[PDB]
Subunit: 251 residues, 4 copies
Amino acid sequence: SLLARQCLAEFLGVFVLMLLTQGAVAQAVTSGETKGNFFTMFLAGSLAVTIAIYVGGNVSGAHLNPAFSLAMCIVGRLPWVKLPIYILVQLLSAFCASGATYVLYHDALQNYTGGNLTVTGPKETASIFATYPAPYLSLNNGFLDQVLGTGMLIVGLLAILDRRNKGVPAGLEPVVVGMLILALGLSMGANCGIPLNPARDLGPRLFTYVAGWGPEVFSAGNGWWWVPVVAPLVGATVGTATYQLLVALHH
Amino acid sequence: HLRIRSLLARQCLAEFLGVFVLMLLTQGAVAQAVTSGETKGNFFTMFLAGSLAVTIAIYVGGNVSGAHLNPAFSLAMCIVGRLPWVKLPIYILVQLLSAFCASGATYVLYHDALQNYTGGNLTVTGPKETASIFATYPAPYLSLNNGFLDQVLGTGMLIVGLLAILDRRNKGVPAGLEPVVVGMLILALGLSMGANCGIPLNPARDLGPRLFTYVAGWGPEVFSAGNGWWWVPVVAPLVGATVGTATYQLLVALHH
Amino acid sequence: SLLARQCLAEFLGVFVLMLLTQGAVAQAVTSGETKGNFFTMFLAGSLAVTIAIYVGGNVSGAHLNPAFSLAMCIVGRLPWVKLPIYILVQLLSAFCASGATYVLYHDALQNYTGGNLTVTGPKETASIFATYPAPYLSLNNGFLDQVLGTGMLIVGLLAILDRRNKGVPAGLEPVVVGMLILALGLSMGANCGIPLNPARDLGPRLFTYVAGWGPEVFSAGNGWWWVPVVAPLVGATVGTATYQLLVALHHP
Amino acid sequence: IRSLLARQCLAEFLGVFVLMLLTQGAVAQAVTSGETKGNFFTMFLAGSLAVTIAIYVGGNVSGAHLNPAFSLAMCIVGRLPWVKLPIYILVQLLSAFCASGATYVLYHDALQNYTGGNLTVTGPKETASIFATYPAPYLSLNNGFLDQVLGTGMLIVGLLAILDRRNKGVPAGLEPVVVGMLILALGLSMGANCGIPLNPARDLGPRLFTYVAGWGPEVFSAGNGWWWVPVVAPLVGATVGTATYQLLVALHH
Ligand SMILES: CCCCCCCCCO[C@@H]1O[C@H](CO)[C@@H](O)[C@@H](O)[C@H]1O
Ligand SMILES: CCCCCCCCCO[C@@H]1O[C@H](CO)[C@@H](O)[C@@H](O)[C@H]1O
Ligand SMILES: CCCCCCCCCO[C@@H]1O[C@H](CO)[C@@H](O)[C@@H](O)[C@H]1O
Ligand SMILES: CCCCCCCCCO[C@@H]1O[C@H](CO)[C@@H](O)[C@@H](O)[C@H]1O
Ligand SMILES: CCCCCCCCCO[C@@H]1O[C@H](CO)[C@@H](O)[C@@H](O)[C@H]1O
Ligand SMILES: CCCCCCCCCO[C@@H]1O[C@H](CO)[C@@H](O)[C@@H](O)[C@H]1O
Ligand SMILES: CCCCCCCCCO[C@@H]1O[C@H](CO)[C@@H](O)[C@@H](O)[C@H]1O
Ligand SMILES: CCCCCCCCCO[C@@H]1O[C@H](CO)[C@@H](O)[C@@H](O)[C@H]1O
Ligand SMILES: CCCCCCCCCO[C@@H]1O[C@H](CO)[C@@H](O)[C@@H](O)[C@H]1O
Ligand SMILES: CCCCCCCCCO[C@@H]1O[C@H](CO)[C@@H](O)[C@@H](O)[C@H]1O
Ligand SMILES: CCCCCCCCCO[C@@H]1O[C@H](CO)[C@@H](O)[C@@H](O)[C@H]1O
Ligand SMILES: CCCCCCCCCO[C@@H]1O[C@H](CO)[C@@H](O)[C@@H](O)[C@H]1O
Ligand SMILES: CCCCCCCCCO[C@@H]1O[C@H](CO)[C@@H](O)[C@@H](O)[C@H]1O
Ligand SMILES: CCCCCCCCCO[C@@H]1O[C@H](CO)[C@@H](O)[C@@H](O)[C@H]1O
Ligand SMILES: CCCCCCCCCO[C@@H]1O[C@H](CO)[C@@H](O)[C@@H](O)[C@H]1O
Ligand SMILES: CCCCCCCCCO[C@@H]1O[C@H](CO)[C@@H](O)[C@@H](O)[C@H]1O
């Protein structure tokens, strides 16, 4: 079954993406920042994307991201009827990787918290799994952040995926994508941590909702949960339109 | 039916796109470090991000063969006869405009963080100054002379490298990796000669955003600060590109 | 017959691997973290794998790791009867490279330790050579940690080596492996370092046993020493069986 | 320039000059900023970037040598005439001396601000080590000599292996990048004892600069007379490294 094969690729790639991304936050948090910090988190996040894109068969393979799946539907490369299935698989995979992360870091989490799982405050561990905005950040500014960041990402991915573009060399495309993730992380990561990917954010938030952290994962940050869902989708639409226009202006 | 037939228009669009990306990533990383109280960025993160921005922007621009992104490089391309002189004012203006616009986007991207960091007080010098998010300012100890030399050298070295990567009489680095190697050059320059004044090496990258901060809340001190520093990142890199290009060219002439 | 050349490549590669890896820990610990830290240790271990793999003739050359050698047997690329030879050579090279590190950092060890060679305290230097778990880590968590990390490394190496995949540009395979090791170190290095390699751990632990640290190197961490030996082997087996199942799933 | 030796000397001067500007530049950036613009990691990283840039400048690994130790290796394998060895070393030495003056000028204002004009070799505000290397205070001469024999021997074996057109190694056009990875690995694993000068010209030439440029004879007496270890020990490392490389090739063929 082709759909099944496509679904396997999404599940595998999102799983590896999420393990490495979340593991790097758990490493920094539960170690008191003696084995990780903000830079380590951004770098491991960009290496996670490089590796996951390889796992998924490169940029032309798995999407790993509802935002990118939307972009593929817009340009005609993925049938609209398959979009919910992809997003479902990507969400489930991120949910499952959060469980793997929880088990990988069980002793470290227990040691750091004494078993007290919190969303805010000095020992909070909710942000190992999903993102939370900086304390100063309004919903509007956060929405803008993650329209711009995701639209930049999407235009970069589409230009790499576009075979008529002379860009990066065969077999290195995931490495350059990793470079862009790093650049975005270090230049646009301060407001709310470049989730850039609604499955990357909602799947794990749901995991922490049911695995001990409770409803505050949805009320925290002024109801922040829906911004990493909606804004990347807006960013993918605007980014796909921008890219399609640029192509039209060029030939 | 939307195809741009004019070559000049296509070239201008590339300048605009590449400079815009270069400047968003470059200024964003300074803003991230500054506004976060250095908990989300720092000097190293700024130097690394600025060299990543160059790599990414040169890909966006069509590799080193495509967009210039830099009035100093555009001068070099004229000097070696690859850009008609008459197009040079057009390129520089589009570069300036793109950098100005990208500063606007940075300002909107970091509005809440700026307000929180400054309480609304937009200063150019002092513990909480934020003008250096957009344009570059010299260390307090630096004279114009030393600052001038610093930018002549940094920019001259950059241009010579770009010329060597471009020159097809050389063996060249692998196709599709030029931008990565340019990025590595930018990183090296930032860690070895970025202390005096933040290595702008690009008049558009500096003046455009300085003009933005002039009108967007920082006032005329952006032009008086540093003993009238604003003109050094304009003139010195152009002097550096001229000396670098002349140096590259006789070296080549010297081996023929 | 290429057995002797195959052994030489294992010995050379492991030796560069261990010098660079251990040196970076010694540089960090011994300088009071003024010339190294957790991050340079993880990055140095990445560079070391990249350099050692070039030295060993790239991913299809020296194995450098009992867990990869085990994977080569399972998939039928290394004869089972050579597995004990490769592991022995890998173990011996890691033991010798620890001697080289000790000599390299002789004055710095004495300055850091005043001659007191311990495992566990504030001036402990045993973890320059072999890996010890975080104080909170149970043997269960540490075992799972190594099984997962090594399994991920091995799936990555299999996919790079497998010529049915489109591949990574020729002569950059080692650089991409190094990026995986960096990713593993930053995302799952906190529990017990990322030995990922039985010879890289047991070889040097044997060295510290006889070179001055004593039997504590085997009782510390609730008898930690066997976990970096057995867990990467289980990870190699589980990763290999997973790579082969996925693959078979895409064939008839 | 019709003279072959002339063009070869020019290549050595230009390569070493860039190597030194970038290498010393990063130490001045870290020291004179009070480590707000650089630190130990930055110095190691910029050192490794300087080498790959300078090796490009020189025409890749099969171009300029940039290093008395590597030229000795080239003489031993017959790829460079012995009678040209004192010439190469002298040009490498003088390039490093000239590059140190460029560093002093580039960082003139930063140096005055940091020292108040008192140039010292030891103590809280010493600036001598911007230009040349000094050993960790705990290090004996013997241990530093071993440190530089091993570090340089490993560098030389890597470089010979890359030069050796019989080896499948790095993609054409990226050999200087992999050498720079090597220099970073060496800096992070073996840079604590005395930096990783690995290069007699990189060390002596700058030391002679600071000697005449205001730091005085103490650059030669500091570190229990340390100055000759980064001169002699890389030469022994190159010799040992070259024999080792030749042994290993023979062991395969
Ligand atoms: C664990 C660290 C590195 C693992 C790297 C795996 C690289 C090989 C992946 O190839 C792709 O796998 C997809 C499944 O996801 C399939 O759809 C298939 O088409 C194939 O082309
Ligand atoms: C799998 C899709 C289902 C996800 C739905 C989870 C969101 C449930 C709504 O939670 C509420 O969100 C408000 C913001 O609207 C917050 O103010 C807060 O009070 C919170 O209680
Ligand atoms: C990262 C943002 C940049 C995305 C821009 C996508 C534009 C695609 C350009 O296509 C190329 O345009 C040339 C003319 O310019 C043509 O001759 C032809 O070669 C065509 O294939
Ligand atoms: C993040 C890395 C992205 C790699 C590939 C992006 C570049 C692909 C298109 O580039 C170039 O767009 C220029 C406009 O800027 C045009 O002039 C056009 O001729 C085109 O060729
Ligand atoms: C780190 C950035 C430094 C700038 C890179 C310089 C690019 C010039 C590439 O051309 C050639 O690369 C060849 C490899 O084959 C070498 O032989 C060398 O002769 C040179 O002619
Ligand atoms: C429209 C593009 C040009 C941008 C701004 C033009 C120059 C602004 C000049 O400002 C003045 O420059 C003097 C010279 O350094 C300083 O001493 C100080 O008096 C400053 O107030
Ligand atoms: C920092 C480095 C910048 C200086 C650039 C020096 C360029 C040297 C001139 O080119 C060289 O001319 C040789 C003979 O004319 C050719 O055989 C070929 O080798 C070519 O590469
Ligand atoms: C700084 C790293 C530079 C490395 C440049 C290339 C290294 C070449 C390694 O050669 C390999 O040596 C193996 C012995 O270990 C042998 O098995 C042999 O087959 C050979 O292929
Ligand atoms: C203590 C365990 C640590 C290393 C693992 C040892 C693996 C032993 C495998 O033996 C081999 O099994 C093959 C298939 O099972 C058989 O074909 C046969 O060739 C036999 O020789
Ligand atoms: C489950 C997938 C198993 C795939 C394992 C087989 C890997 C193929 C080995 O590669 C080959 O190794 C040679 C040396 O042995 C090299 O010289 C080169 O020719 C290379 O192509
Ligand atoms: C740091 C990440 C390390 C993982 C490297 C993963 C294996 C790379 C093998 O080559 C890749 O094979 C894929 C499967 O065919 C293709 O999709 C193609 O794009 C190609 O590049
Ligand atoms: C050259 C390598 C030799 C192989 C090393 C394996 C021997 C390890 C045994 O440790 C023993 O653990 C005891 C705990 O009961 C200690 O009290 C003491 O008896 C010690 O001897
Ligand atoms: C060639 C491999 C030989 C290595 C043998 C190591 C000796 C075994 C370690 O001794 C004991 O292990 C116990 C449980 O593991 C610990 O609780 C502790 O009491 C320790 O002293
Ligand atoms: C920061 C500046 C980066 C410039 C990189 C320049 C790389 C091109 C240098 O090519 C080589 O120049 C040698 C002179 O040194 C000559 O011998 C000649 O044979 C040529 O092949
Ligand atoms: C630090 C690296 C150690 C150097 C080891 C080099 C000796 C191996 C030489 O033979 C290797 O094998 C084949 C011929 O033997 C070819 O592939 C050849 O080009 C080389 O690869
Ligand atoms: C080719 C140029 C050679 C440069 C070196 C020549 C000067 C030697 C330095 O003099 C003395 O060296 C003694 C030997 O260690 C030290 O004890 C120390 O007191 C120092 O004063």
